[PDB]
Design a protein around this ligand. Sequence first.
Ligand SMILES: N[C@@H](CCCC[NH3+])C(=O)O
Ligand SMILES: [Ca+2]
Ligand SMILES: [Ca+2]
Ligand SMILES: [Ca+2]
Ligand SMILES: [Ca+2]
Ligand SMILES: [Zn+2]
Length: 316
Amino acid sequence: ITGTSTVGVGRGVLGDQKNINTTYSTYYYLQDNTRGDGIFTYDAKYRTTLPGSLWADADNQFFASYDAPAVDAHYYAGVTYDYYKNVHNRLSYDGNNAAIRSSVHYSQGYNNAFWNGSEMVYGDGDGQTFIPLSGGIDVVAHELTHAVTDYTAGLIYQNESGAINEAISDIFGTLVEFYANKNPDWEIGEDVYTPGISGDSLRSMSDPAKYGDPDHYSKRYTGTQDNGGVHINSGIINKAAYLISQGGTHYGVSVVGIGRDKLGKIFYRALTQYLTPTSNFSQLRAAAVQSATDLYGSTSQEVASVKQAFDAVGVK
Ligand SMILES: N[C@@H](CCCC[NH3+])C(=O)O
Ligand SMILES: [Ca+2]
Ligand SMILES: [Ca+2]
Ligand SMILES: [Ca+2]
Ligand SMILES: [Ca+2]
Ligand SMILES: [Zn+2]
């Protein structure tokens, strides 16, 4: 829509108030013109046809409970865009400021969110397992990161390459959460997962086993479920990333942490420069080591920690 850029105010899924960039033209639309070619948020109206209708609002005030998921989807997509631009110098997911689109209120009682190859989609959850998914910043960054991966490495969504695809989304989803500095942690989706239970999450990077996910190559899932365990075996890579950043001793292997900042730089480089559509865990290890070598030298503590971390999760 062609209109006048302005700023509206609303309340997100968790009841927090925030300002959002909108566009005015008779109605106030959830169209952010301040970032690349724009961030557009649509209403799927409980249906499955996409994208739906660009979110129109009469007074630029988004305090209705129905508005909540839209406020967060729109706002968190903005934060994720900022993360990539300011930290990795990447303009949007394609690197050329492509418009970012998201639809909320997708279907009925849909307990998931996803990037469908062209846009992000968020279910409202069934109120038991999940509440509107866009309410989790790590969930939004996780999905948008799929767009980044699909435009760069292009990891196919199956077996080890798909687990890597999933881990990268969890890794950057987490880094974005730390970036926005909003109750950051190394868990996934804890802000929108099971409202009736405190302290749990969908997945854990610091301790994947906490929910039955493998934290070592020897425990990798080899079946065909979940496209060969893309959300399962991602735990092995998530654990490695956590160790690289925070350090620790895993299975008798000690790793000196180097921090989130360097973790992000190393993985972003591996993702955009060395990973390919069919890269496996072993190749990720090589990509990560080479990336750290490029950035800090082959005899650096950084290259050393990447090696220990992958040895710790049994990835050779
Ligand atoms: N996003 C993951 C976990 C979702 C859990 C149930 N929504 C998947 O689609 O498998
Ligand atoms: Ca309104
Ligand atoms: Ca958190
Ligand atoms: Ca989190
Ligand atoms: Ca919970
Ligand atoms: Zn994913």
